[PDB]
Amino acid sequence: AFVVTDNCIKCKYTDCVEVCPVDCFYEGPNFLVIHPDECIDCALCEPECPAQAIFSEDEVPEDMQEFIQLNAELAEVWPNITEKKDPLPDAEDWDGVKGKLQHLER
Numbered sequence: 001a002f003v004v005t006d007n008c009i010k011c012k013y014t015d016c017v018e019v020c021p022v023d024c025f026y027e028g029p030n031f032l033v034i035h036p037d038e039c040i041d042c043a044l045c046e047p048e049c050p051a052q053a054i055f056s057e058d059e060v061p062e063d064m065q066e067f068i069q070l071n072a073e074l075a076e077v078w079p080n081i082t083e084k085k086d087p088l089p090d091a092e093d094w095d096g097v098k099g100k101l102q103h104l105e106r
């Protein structure tokens with residue numbers, strides 16, 4: 001599985017969904033997650049993230065290990081997103097800000 005981590009929160013560009021062949025992204029108010037059973041690990045999405053928030057499961061940073069299980073949890077509850085949309089209004093003010101997990105919305 002590929003994993004979306006911290007920097008997608010409050011940025012949510014959705015460029016990553018374009019490239020996904022199996023459509024395993026699920027959409028939350030201000031973050032996207034990859035469904036881990038569905039992802040085929042083609043790695044096509046992680047060049048496409050402007051926030052460079054996607055990581056192969058085995059490359060997730062040590063301080064972001066939470067995100068692996070979070071993507072699994074939330075994929076189960078959020079709706080499937082299959083088309084790109086506009087980025088969140090203030091997306092590049094938040095791009096690169098750290099600790100954005102306290103801002104996640106369910």
Ligand code: SF4
Pocket residue numbers: 001002016019020021022023024025034038039040041042043044045046
């Ligand atoms: S690694 Fe390939 S199948 Fe997995 S979520 Fe990324 S674009 Fe979709």
Ligand code: F3S
Pocket residue numbers: 004007008009011012013014015016017031032048049050051052053054
């Ligand atoms: S910021 Fe989030 S919505 Fe796709 S493009 Fe990058 S993972």
